[PDB]
């Protein structure tokens, strides 16, 4: 199975994705949306291009991404959660023409 991450609409949700800091050393990370069982993963956010500045929060839409490089932890922060933000998502390590799946996370949004 995969881990479920619940968030109240309008509030922020912080998803964690630990990874081997040495196996993926020098590889940027991404956070994408799964569109089906065999469907593609549509990119939502990506860490900063420079590998040093990956710890900072790269913002796309209302989704920020930080990458603790030395500790090896990919944090995603979805602020002002909306119902259309609900779905299955992937943490990915990008290398060359490929992307390895670190963790599959189901994001669900609750009312107030």
């Amino acid at each position, epitope marked *: 199975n995969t881990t479920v991450f619940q968030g109240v*609409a309008g509030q922020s949700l912080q998803v964690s994705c630990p990874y081997d800091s040495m196996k993926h050393w020098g590889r940027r990370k991404a956070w994408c949306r*799964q569109l089906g069982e065999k469907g593609p993963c549509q990119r939502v956010v990506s860490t900063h291009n420079l590998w040093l500045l990956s710890f900072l929060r790269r913002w796309n839409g209302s989704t920020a991404i930080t990458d603790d490089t030395l500790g090896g932890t990919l944090t995603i922060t979805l602020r002002n959660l909306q*119902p259309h933000d*609900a*779905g*299955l998502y992937q943490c990915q390590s990008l290398h060359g023409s490929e992307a390895d799946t670190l963790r599959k996370v189901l994001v*669900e949004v609750l009312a107030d």
Partner: single-chain antibody, 231 residues
Framework: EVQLLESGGGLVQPGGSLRLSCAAS????????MGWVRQAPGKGLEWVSY????????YYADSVKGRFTISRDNSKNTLYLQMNSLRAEDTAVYYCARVGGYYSWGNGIDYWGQGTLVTVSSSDIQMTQSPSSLSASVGDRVTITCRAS??????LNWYQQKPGKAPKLLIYAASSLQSGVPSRFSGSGSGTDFTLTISSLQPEDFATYYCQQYGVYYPFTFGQGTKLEIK
């Protein structure tokens, strides 16, 4: 292939409990959100409850909130609604509903069940439809308007309920047509006012049409409905 079969409807005396079980066949159950939507006899639609793909997220309407309990079993592909401490106004046709989004809310309730009758012996976003009644002839361009109170951008859905039959998703995202919808239907709109257009009306289009807010604010409220009957 796809089928949703409700069970448990009938008569229940007031105050008592009642369980409704929906059997699902012909699709991927564990991936799609599910729900129950009611229709009072000869009245418009009204959302009852929604349940998550993992079952760990339930959303009841404010009326039934605190009394009903939605449930699901993915190993048996069944969707339950437990109506404890019923009431006299709860009576309606209850419809088992698929969400049609891979772990997301997707486009809208795509496939509806045929529903079961539950009778009992005795702020919000207002979605208003103009008009309520309309008498047209075969081959008439018809226009229906749907108005929201607060802006909803482009997250409007149009459903078409045939006389006595279960509804079906017609227009998703206001602009685009559902796969299989005839070419003549044309949805449009943005913000607060939205319009649906029938160009060259055909005989099987005489029916009730409902609009719904779907995507922005979790009060996924339906419209009051427009009855396109015959002249």
């Amino acid at each position: 292939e796809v089928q949703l079969l409700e069970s448990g409807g009938g008569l229940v005396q007031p105050g008592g409990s009642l369980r409704l079980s929906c059997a699902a066949s012909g699709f991927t159950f564990y991936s799609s959100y599910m729900g129950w939507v009611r229709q009072a006899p000869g009245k418009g639609l009204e959302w009852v409850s929604y349940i998550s793909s993992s079952g760990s997220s339930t959303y009841y309407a404010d009326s039934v909130k605190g009394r009903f309990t939605i449930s699901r079993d993915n190993s048996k592909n069944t969707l339950y609604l437990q109506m404890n401490s019923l009431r006299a106004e709860d009576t309606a046709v209850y419809y088992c509903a698929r969400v049609g989004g891979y772990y997301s809310w997707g486009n809208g309730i795509d496939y509806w069940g045929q529903g079961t009758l539950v009778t009992v012996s005795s702020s919000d976003i207002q979605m208003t439809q103009s008009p309520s009644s309309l008498s047209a002839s075969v081959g008439d361009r018809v226009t229906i308007t749907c108005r929201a109170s607060q802006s909803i951008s482009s997250y409007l859905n149009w459903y078409q309920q045939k006389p006595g039959k279960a509804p079906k998703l017609l227009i998703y995202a206001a602009s685009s047509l559902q796969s299989g919808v005839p070419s003549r239907f044309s949805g449009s709109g943005s913000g607060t006012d939205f319009t649906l257009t029938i160009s060259s009306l055909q005989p099987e289009d005489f029916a009730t049409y409902y609009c719904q807010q779907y995507g922005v604010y979790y009060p996924f409220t339906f419209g009051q409905g427009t009855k396109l009957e015959i002249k």
